[PDB]
Symmetry: none
Subunit: 173 residues, 2 copies
Amino acid sequence: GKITFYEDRGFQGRHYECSSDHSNLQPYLGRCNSVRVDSGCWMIYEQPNYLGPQYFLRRGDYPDYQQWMGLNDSIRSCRLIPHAGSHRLRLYEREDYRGQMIEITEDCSSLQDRFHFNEIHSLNVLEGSWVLYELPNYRGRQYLLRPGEYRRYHDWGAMNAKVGSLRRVIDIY
Amino acid sequence: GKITFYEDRGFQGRHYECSSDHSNLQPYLGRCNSVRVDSGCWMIYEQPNYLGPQYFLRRGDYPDYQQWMGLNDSIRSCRLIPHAGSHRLRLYEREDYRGQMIEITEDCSSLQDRFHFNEIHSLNVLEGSWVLYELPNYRGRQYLLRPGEYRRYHDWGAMNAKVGSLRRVIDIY
């Protein structure tokens, strides 16, 4: 993949280009006000070492931080999210894989409407990466879910078990 | 009505309880090798949206799929068959309601024996729901017939016009 970060709005200023995961953009970029995603699906984070709020971005032009639904111009690390041919995920009602389990292979814009669930307490990401949204219709705080187990909501980095929508991470060509 | 599906034989593993129609059980059940029907008469289908092979089940326990004469352990949808206090059906010799017409208001273990027919090309279900079996004594492939007309066999989901027995969807509770 290939992503280019710019210090100022509208693709101006000092810029930095990445073709891979970057744990601390700080020495090469003072702030991030626009981004051009040439290829790949990327998750960008507010602090180094993949901490803080995260935002999913796919191929396209982002002339301002609001275009990626960003909160501010602090972007300090990023991950290139590998493409997956298939997506499969199990959501559990209680911590540690307990209570009712629901398995999904497609995007879900509303968990409450589709399955009458408003919170997920544990999950197992079997295949592909997904982005978990706190609010329906893919809004709210975003959390990247990569293949693997998450026994509690803290493990995917949320502050609570609230989930509103889920989307698989797929390439836009 | 109330039915409980289990992923494993003998009522073990992940289960899911239903009390109404479900066009897609895939998220709640990865397979089905046992069913416990507490009430109602139900049709279960191999595919979502009531497609593929169909099987009729009434109150009672089914410890394995052979119990409901299933072909395998894939159950993707199910529907509660509303009861009726009366049944009436007209079978036709030929497609589109032509040829001899036989009207029955009771179960028929053998079509060939009783009416000397081996195939039915069209039907008109006037009252109640019936289950048509490809073979005598109520075995073979099953097809739920709800009130309504069927110009041809494809209409009730069969692969050919062969009919062996017919049974009225009657309740034990």
